[PDB]
Structure 1
Amino acid sequence: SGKVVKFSYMWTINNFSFCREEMGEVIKSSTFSSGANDKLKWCLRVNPKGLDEESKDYLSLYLLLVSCPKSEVRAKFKFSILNAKGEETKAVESQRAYRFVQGKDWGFKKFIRRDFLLDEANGLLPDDKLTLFCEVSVVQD
């Protein structure tokens, strides 16, 4: 029917300050999906120490379409970090919809400054846990 499908996914990474990934290495989430009948599968991929030299001071975060879609997929997405109260903070939005094929990622190489994240005063790493939040809005042709 082409009805827009909206859904959210959240993922807690333990001991985030101790992650050994260096620049360009990736942490992968589990797959997730809507509650509709299409059953597109998605995942998040995060670069704890940045994608590349340009984003070396940042956490980099991407949404990837994992499964094989039956028709064209266009999606909007927004990433945020949950504080200890579960409140969304430091949100970054795609604004426009992007075309996804199987294996395609879209995201922000400069999602958040690593030094801002690691400062306990900002409350984004309670108990050294990083909880990432993604909302996806998808239309299928």
Structure 2
Amino acid sequence: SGKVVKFSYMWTINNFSFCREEMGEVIKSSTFSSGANDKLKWCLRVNPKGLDEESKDYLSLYLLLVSCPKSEVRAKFKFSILNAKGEETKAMESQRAYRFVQGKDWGFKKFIRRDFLLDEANGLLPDDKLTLFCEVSVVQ
């Protein structure tokens, strides 16, 4: 079977400044698929107020492998924010592929400073909307 081997997931969180999540709490995206017969299932998990105390000043952002047909897959990934014109900003990338076993995440605990993100001058929350962009490439 042919496979979707690279994919870009776009997710807009409305009223981002209004997120009531406390530190440690998560917003989980819808599940998206890739690979042999949509058999790789993924989602994003974001902590608007950081994963933990170390990251209390940041938004934390992770890619989760929800399920896979075998034990694992290896994948490279990149996260960025889209500005009002749909252009990528503040990208962070994994560089190498990471081992995703079923149920495991990988990402950036200190993806972006909350104060920087929330400041209207920086144009990262047009209409108070956060648009995240996740590009994934799965090792074959």
TM-score bin, normalised by smaller chain: over 0.9
Q: Deviations over 1:58-107 (max 9, x none)?
A: 00000000123325410000000001111111000000100001110000
Moved more, 109-118 or 34-43: 34-43
Say if 1:12 and 1:129, in contact at 8 Å, map to a contact too: yes
Q: Using structure 1 for the length normalisation, give the TM-score.
A: 0.92
Cα shift at 1:3: 7.5
Rounded Cα–Cα distance in structure 1 between residues aligned with 2:62 and 2:105? 6
Say if 1:59 and 1:110, in contact at 8 Å, map to a contact too: yes
Find the residue that maps to 1:127 and give its secondary structure: helix
Partner of 1:74 in structure 2?
A: 74
Q: Using structure 2 for the length normalisation, give the TM-score.
A: 0.93
Partner of 1:33 in structure 2?
A: 33
Rounded Cα–Cα distance in structure 1 between residues aligned with 2:29 and 2:121? 26
Moved more, 30-39 or 61-70: 30-39
Rounded Cα–Cα distance in structure 2 between residues aligned with 1:43 and 1:53? 24
Higher strand share: 2
Aligned CA-pair RMSD: 1.9
Cα shift at 1:38: 4.7
Say if 1:7 and 1:136, in contact at 8 Å, map to a contact too: yes
Cα shift at 1:33: 2.0
Aligned in 2, Cα 1:36/1:88: closer, same or farther, shift over 3 Å?
A: farther
Question: Percentage identity across aligned positions?
Answer: 99
Rounded Cα–Cα distance in structure 2 between residues aligned with 1:35 and 1:89? 28
Count of equivalent residues: 140
Find the residue that maps to 2:37 and give its secondary structure: coil
Say if 1:2 and 1:139, in contact at 8 Å, map to a contact too: no
Cα shift at 1:39: 2.8
Rounded Cα–Cα distance in structure 2 between residues aligned with 1:74 and 1:2? 18
